[PDB]
């Protein structure tokens, strides 16, 4: 159990890192699709 709990916390943390690294590129995106439809 301590081994698997240690591997769940590393994947769940590698995670909010991935899930967040995105809100940034998908939002940089609605933006970087809106200015060329405007320019």
């Amino acid at each position: 159990v301590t081994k698997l709990e240690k591997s769940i916390d590393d994947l769940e943390d590698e995670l909010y890192a991935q899930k967040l690294k995105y809100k940034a590129i998908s939002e940089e995106l609605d933006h970087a699709l809106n200015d060329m439809t405007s320019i």
């Binding site: 995670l15 991935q18 899930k19 690294k21 995105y22």
Partner: protein
């Protein structure tokens, strides 16, 4: 884009499992056991048909809901052509 894979599982499984029980809850209500077993002999007669009608009842509705989707499916096809036609990015 693979961090969104865990979203697929959670999402799909979620919604699908939600839908299931609902269907079960719903369908269960509309169900009254065949309790009447060996209580009379001519009863079966006045009973059997009632079940028969209920079946025919449902059957007929299923047929209508069916033809309906078809008609709607066509409303869509057209409603889609109006969407493209009304594109003209000009």
């Amino acid at each position: 884009s693979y961090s969104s894979y865990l979203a697929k599982a959670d999402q799909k499984r979620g919604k699908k499992q939600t839908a299931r029980e609902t269907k079960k809850k719903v369908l269960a209500e509309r169900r009254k056991p065949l309790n009447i077993d060996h209580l009379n002999e001519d009863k079966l007669r006045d009973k059997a048909k009632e079940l028969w009608d209920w079946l025919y009842q449902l059957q007929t509705e299923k047929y209508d809901f069916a033809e309906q989707i078809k008609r709607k499916k066509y409303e869509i096809v057209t409603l889609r052509n109006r969407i493209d036609q009304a594109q003209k990015h000009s």
